[PDB]
Amino acid sequence: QRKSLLDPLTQLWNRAGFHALHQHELELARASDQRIGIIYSDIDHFKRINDTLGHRAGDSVLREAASRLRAALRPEDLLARFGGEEFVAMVRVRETTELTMIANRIRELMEATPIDCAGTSVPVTISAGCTLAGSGEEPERALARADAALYDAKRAGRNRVVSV
Amino acid sequence: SLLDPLTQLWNRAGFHALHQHELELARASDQRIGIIYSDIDHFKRINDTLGHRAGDSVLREAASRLRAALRPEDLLARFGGEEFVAMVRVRETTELTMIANRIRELMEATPIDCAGTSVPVTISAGCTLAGSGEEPERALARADAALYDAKRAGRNRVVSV
Ligand SMILES: Nc1nc2c(ncn2[C@@H]2O[C@@H]3COP(=O)(O)O[C@H]4[C@@H](O)[C@H](n5cnc6c(=O)[nH]c(N)nc65)O[C@@H]4COP(=O)(O)O[C@H]3[C@H]2O)c(=O)[nH]1
Ligand SMILES: Nc1nc2c(ncn2[C@@H]2O[C@@H]3COP(=O)(O)O[C@H]4[C@@H](O)[C@H](n5cnc6c(=O)[nH]c(N)nc65)O[C@@H]4COP(=O)(O)O[C@H]3[C@H]2O)c(=O)[nH]1
Fold it and tell me: Which positions in this protein are listed as binding 3',3'-c-di-GMP (chain A) (predicted)?
């Protein structure tokens, strides 16, 4: 099947599939009088995990992450993995306060429970940047603003959310 | 219209009027009609010890917390007394039970402000899914009965049936 729109490892959307889904969400969003929020998150200290315990361990962390995230969001919310240890969500909401709240939700639940990697339990946190797609703003533009907030989130110490 | 004057929530009439529409909706998205039936615990004690204005305020804050604790499409109603009925489309009763306990918890999490008087309140609920072609009223009764068991068991308690 023409399933090259998925991330093989986690079965989430990949960068390409994610970007194609934008337009239709723009439709839905204007439709239901909602806003389009992006949450861009990244697993903290991922190399440390990988280099220390091996690629399988890291792939395990990634799989557990994708799963927790998927489970913490409504069915219609887009969730993707572009590569590395980063998960990007797109949610239809009313205002940014709600987006931040969703972001810290994901963050806390990732922090709340360690992850089993071949009998070795590994504690992980996640950082996120999040923003609303501006009125008449293009998709990539908002994505980059969220990527940049994520950067600031890492710099500010990690395990935190930066709403912008 | 089809509203409870006091709280501007649906009344028994408004409830039954939407039901058939909720059936159609539930069928479309392969969901089940969930009913949560709840009653404020020890409500007369409040009315007596602080007055009908107070009792009426507690009722107003509940409608507001409940309503804020559900999604817009979830039906929230007050038939009368101090009881709030909710109708929510879901896929299995564990989900209905969680929703119920959530409402219960937030009701207990914060006293209710009665004009410079914060009063602790709790709520009890009984919940159930409607069977295929079941009369709303039958489902209503089953949840009302579980609500009763929840009261008899000690209140501040959910009974899923
Ligand atoms: N697309 C999307 N939107 C989200 C998500 N989480 C939150 N929101 C939005 O943010 C609003 C406020 O959410 P809230 O503070 O959690 O406050 C929530 C929450 O207390 C309650 N609640 C509603 N649905 C659920 C649920 O499926 N699980 C849990 N635990 N609580 C819920 O209802 C309140 C408001 O319901 P809403 O009117 O729907 O209002 C929501 C909703 O539009 C999400 O994962 N995806
Ligand atoms: N109509 C209706 N259905 C409800 C309500 N609450 C829960 N559900 C349903 O119950 C499922 C699981 O809820 P969950 O355990 O809280 O697990 C939730 C929860 O962690 C997260 N969550 C989703 N929306 C919200 C929200 O608005 N606020 C908060 N705090 N959490 C949410 O998404 C997870 C699953 O989302 P779902 O796929 O949508 O799946 C949901 C959803 O179908 C409600 O107030 N109204």
Answer: 74, 77, 92, 94, 105
Q: Which of B71, B94, B129 to mutate to test the pocket of ligand 2 (most atoms within 8 A of CB)?
A: B71
Nearest to residue A85, comparing CAs of A52, A44, A144, A143?
Answer: A44
Strands B158-160 and B123-129, how do they pair? Answer: parallel
Q: Which two tokens stand for residue A156?
A: 């500010």
The dihedrals phi and psi of A89, each to the nearest 5 degrees, come to -115, 145
**First and final CA of chain A: distance in angstroms?**
39
Domains of chain A, by residue range, sit at 1-164
Among residues B76, B79, B97, B103, which one has the least CA distance to residue B87? B76
CATH of span A1-164: 3.30.70.270
Atom number, ligand 2, closest to the C-alpha of residue A73: 33
Q: Which of B73, B82, B95, B137 is catalytic?
A: B82
Any idea which residue has 């959530």 for tokens?
B102
Do B125 and B108 meet the contact criterion of CB atoms below 8 Å apart?
no
Distance CA B61, CA B56 (A): 9
User: Is the C-beta atom of A101 inside 6 A of ligand 1?
Assistant: yes
Experimental method: X-ray
Q: How far apart are CA B6 and CA A61, in angstroms?
A: 52
* Run of H or E residues at B47: helix B43-50
Domain B1-161 has CATH 3.40.710.10: no
The two beta strands, A161-163 and A126-132, are parallel
Report how far ligand 2's centroid is from the alpha carbon of A51 (Å): 37
d(CA B66, CA B102): 10
Bridge-based pairing of strands B75-80 and A120-122 is unpaired
